[PDB]
Design a protein around this ligand. Structure first.
Ligand code: ADP
Ligand code: ADP
Ligand code: MG
Ligand code: MG
Lengths: 98, 31, 76, 77, 523, 107, 31
């Protein structure tokens, strides 16, 4: 829905959110190429509670496996990390103090 | 017409890639 | 290198090759008016660009298919 | 004319020499293209894709670039 | 002096490498902080070699130059110049460093033109006098009609915070900076605004507290919240007094008399606390430490006891509650007590702080800065300190000028108009003074990525015929009116940028010999 | 002095290829200034020998032979005038001997 | 008026005295 240079950065913001399911699928011994691809197919249909099932070794329901994460954990992980990376591209000059 | 040309011959285009490559090594360490 | 933006220039040339049949559509420094490379007479050999894609692919295959480095330390 | 003692970057020196010995015009563009194929393979490496599976995918992709480049080609010398 | 050198380990140079090392060392200082000038300039990260390096990112030009430690002798004059600019007005330390370096860069262009350096000093003194009249005649005063003065104060804080890390927080941090000085209602002491930095949360979660925050929580068995209390603070010793008689011992004959003395010592410590609670108070703040024997007396009477807040902590509590220090308790009718509504304890970042909610005569504030990292909190504290110091002097001097390159083109126009009414000996030095004043909007325009060769040319054509309020619009990248956009700076800030850079460039240009002595412990 | 003015175009953010293309048009216009102002000398050889002494008088003015233009100009013009052909620049053998002033030198 | 001012801030005003003082030591050695 955006245009200009803003549309190329939200896609870079959205592609960086797929790293944590790629991290969870790679550490579980699953194939991370087909796991994150299947996760985008389940959430496009309407499955908002779909994720990586480390017990079955695939994609299943999360609330059936009783995996509950608080909202303040995930909101502050997105708010503090975005505020940090908004400063590193602004703070860039190496000055070695004597 | 090209409507201008902004020549940027300075340092911090290379140091900006150094902060990116250093933070990628930390994320791959605790991956 | 010409002073333009890489997104604002590559998106316009690539979109014009899909709406019509794909012309000799590139870029230039002083831009010579239009972006038609057939009118600007920018002519390169076929086997020159054929070996650019063929040699760079085989050199990437020999540096992707390697998982060990056995270099020494100091000279002596 | 560099003093690069790096065995991966030494192969980029022999790549520019091999373009000079066969054709002799695109010695600069064959190093930027080889660095571009390896830069795009860095993000594919983090997704768990095998490096030979990327190399097998580049051969099926470069085969399309050879056949498509032979569409418009004519000279009257 | 180089020929037949009569020095031990010292070297010198006269008129060949003296002005060469002075112009190299001063331009490299100005070219260092050149990238930090303007609303689109980047920031620096300062690091050491090791041994508790303590990295401190700063965008202000004074904090960069005070930590680098330049070895050049002439570069230390520009470092000390930006130190006074931070201590006097608190802003323009980066603008005074680039302006003093662009004067010496134009003076380096007068090397090959064979201009006498005393002619450049006499040419710049007449140029600085013409530039003082440009800012004084264009200053906008504000007396009555206070609804336009509070709107003018938000343009001062909006201009200062635009060149810092608080870029997309001007809807919040402008209100945190204007209302902090507006709650002072008097002199700009610049210490009643206690800034507390806590990790966790974004910069949008930061706020200005309506009361006051403190540490060193309330006792052990004392109440944590008292509604409608009378706050009495103190600066006296509670226990282990050893009261002011050096050389006094307890020389008794038996150990039964020692038990009578130590009971008499605790009775006088109990009688001192009984003189405190005769005022009818519920809270007690002592600058010194409170030991266990008076702490039990305040807990039995239902009185709070805040022990060892700070040396300057009782000063802010005296300005936010409306009381006095009251270090002696012998006249309850001559001791004024504080006033509050709630002394409940709040938790900010897993740390319990004493919140003095609902205080009367609150001439003190508490800014609760919350950031993602410690590097952001150290930058946002210096960014807020560069904004509160200008508003503390804008309420003392209400004269404001139009910033954003508009003030520099007004100063450069008055020099160029008087450069044509002068003979050719000093007219070339005055034209170099006007070109350095036009470099200050050129650094701002080129830091964003705009066409700096055309925007300053459009500013020079605008100010040549009218347009006294025309400046640089960094939002869209064009030329707009500064009175409409609301980009104004203080008169005393812009005067100290012009005056201190003209005096510092006068010192370095008059140097023809740099005789450095032999250093100690350097081999 | 061209690269000193090119150092002034560093802070103006001018592209360096624009300075190269700007100087190629500038050098092409500068060739037409010297070509249209060149003074030729064919016949009337009494004005060409006077013109040759102005060439040697300008070259020797920027050297150590400052107050010797009444002698060293005639030693340089008549040396090439006695060649009467190609400028081989080896038939003029210069012999350096100590003793005497520079006015004592001769052809 | 002063009819001009020629500022000469360069090296060889001091090296010219070095050639004078060196030649005076030679003339005083064989004096
Ligand atoms: N007039 C022009 N307009 C647009 N592009 C051009 C023009 N002239 C040359 N180029 C581009 O510049 C590139 C130069 O490549 P080059 O460095 O010569 O390759 P190699 O190093 O193999 O000789 C070519 O790929 C070509 O596409
Ligand atoms: N909104 C704005 N529009 C135009 N110019 C601005 C704006 N905000 C800030 N500036 C300019 O940015 C400059 C920042 O200078 P600064 O680095 O704060 O100086 P100092 O270090 O002395 O405080 C100011 O001179 C001001 O003119
Ligand atoms: Mg400022
Ligand atoms: Mg000559």
């Amino acid at each position: 829905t955006l245009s200009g240079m803003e549309s190329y950065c939200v896609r870079a913001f959205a592609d960086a959110m797929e790293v944590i399911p790629s991290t969870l699928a790679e550490n579980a011994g699953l194939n991370p190429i087909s796991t994150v691809t299947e996760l985008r197919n389940r959430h496009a249909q309407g499955e908002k509670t779909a994720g990586i099932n480390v017990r079955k070794g695939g994609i299943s329901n999360i609330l059936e496996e009783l995996v509950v994460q608080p909202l303040l954990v995930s909101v502050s992980a997105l708010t503090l990390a975005t505020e940090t990376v908004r400063s590193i591209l602004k703070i860039d000059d190496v000055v070695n103090t004597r | 017409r090209g409507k201008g040309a902004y020549q940027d011959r300075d340092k911090p285009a290379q140091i900006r890639f150094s902060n990116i490559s250093a933070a990628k090594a930390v994320a791959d360490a605790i991956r | 290198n010409s002073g333009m933006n890489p997104i604002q220039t590559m998106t316009e040339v690539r979109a014009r090759q899909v709406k019509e049949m794909n012309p000799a559509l590139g870029i230039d420094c002083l831009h010579k008016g239009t972006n038609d490379m057939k009118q600007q007479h920018v002519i390169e050999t076929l086997i020159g660009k054929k070996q650019q894609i063929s040699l760079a692919t085989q050199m990437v295959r020999m540096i992707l298919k390697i998982d060990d480095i056995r270099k020494p330390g100091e000279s002596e | 004319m560099m003093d690069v003692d790096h065995q991966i970057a030494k192969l980029m020196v022999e790549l520019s020499k091999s373009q000079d010995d066969e054709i002799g015009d695109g010695t600069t563009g064959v190093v930027v293209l080889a660095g571009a194929l390896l830069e795009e393979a860095e993000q594919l490496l983090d997704r768990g894709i095998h490096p030979i599976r990327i190399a097998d995918g580049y051969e099926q992709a470069a085969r399309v670039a050879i056949e498509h480049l032979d569409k418009i080609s004519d000279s009257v010398l | 002096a180089p020929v037949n050198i009569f020095k031990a380990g010292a070297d010198e140079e006269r008129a060949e490498t003296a002005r060469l090392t002075s112009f190299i060392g001063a331009i490299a200082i100005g070219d260092l902080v050149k990238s930090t000038l303007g609303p689109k300039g980047m920031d620096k990260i300062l690091l050491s070699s090791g041994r508790d390096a303590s990295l401190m990112v700063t965008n202000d030009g004074a904090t960069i130059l005070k930590n680098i430690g330049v070895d050049n002798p002439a570069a230390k004059v520009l470092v000390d110049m930006s130190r006074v600019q931070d201590d006097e007005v608190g802003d323009g330390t980066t603008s005074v460093t680039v302006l003093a370096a662009e004067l010496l860069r134009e003076a380096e262009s007068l090397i090959a033109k064979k201009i006498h350096p005393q002619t450049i000093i006499a040419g710049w003194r007449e140029a600085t006098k013409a530039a003082r009249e440009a800012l004084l005649s264009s200053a906008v005063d504000h007396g009555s009609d206070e609804v336009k003065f509070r709107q003018d104060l938000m343009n001062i804080a909006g201009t200062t915070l635009s060149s810092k890390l608080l870029t997309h927080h001007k809807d919040h941090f402008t209100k945190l900076a204007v209302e902090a000085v507006l709650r002072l209602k008097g002199s700009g002491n610049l210490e009643a605004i206690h800034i507390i930095k806590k990790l966790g949360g974004s910069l949008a979660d930061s706020y200005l507290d309506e009361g006051f925050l403190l540490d060193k929580k309330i006792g052990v068995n004392q109440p944590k919240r008292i509604e409608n209390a009378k706050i009495l603070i103190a600066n006296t010793g509670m226990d282990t007094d050893k009261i002011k008689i050096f050389g006094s011992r307890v020389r008794v004959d038996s150990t039964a008399k020692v038990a009578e003395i130590e009971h008499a010592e605790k009775e006088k410590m109990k009688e001192k606390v009984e003189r405190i609670l005769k005022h009818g108070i519920n809270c007690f703040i002592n600058r010194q430490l409170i030991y266990n024997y008076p702490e039990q007396l305040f807990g039995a009477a239902g009185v709070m006891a805040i022990e060892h807040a700070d040396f300057a902590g009782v000063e802010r509590l005296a300005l936010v509650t409306g009381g006095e220090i009251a270090s002696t308790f012998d006249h309850p009718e001559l001791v004024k007590l504080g006033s509050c509504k709630l002394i409940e304890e709040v938790m900010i970042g897993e740390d319990k702080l004493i919140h003095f909610s609902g205080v009367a005569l609150g001439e003190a504030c508490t800014i609760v800065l919350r950031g993602a990292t410690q590097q952001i909190l150290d930058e946002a504290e210096r960014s807020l300190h560069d904004a509160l110091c200008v508003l503390a002097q804008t309420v003392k001097d209400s004269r404001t000028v139009y910033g954003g390159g508009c003030s520099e083109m007004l100063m450069a126009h008055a020099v160029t108009q008087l450069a044509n009414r002068t003979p050719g000996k000093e007219a070339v030095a005055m034209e170099s003074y006007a070109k350095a004043l036009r470099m200050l909007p050129t650094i701002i325009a080129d830091n964003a990525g705009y066409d700096s060769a055309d925007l300053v040319a459009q500013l020079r054509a605008a100010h040549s015929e009218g347009n006294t309020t025309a400046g640089l619009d960094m939002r869209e990248g064009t030329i707009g009116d500064m009175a409409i956009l609301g980009i104004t700076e203080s008169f005393q800030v812009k005067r100290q940028v012009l005056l201190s850079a003209a005096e510092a460039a006068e010192v370095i240009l008059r140097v023809d010999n740099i005789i450095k002595a032999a250093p100690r412990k350097r081999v």
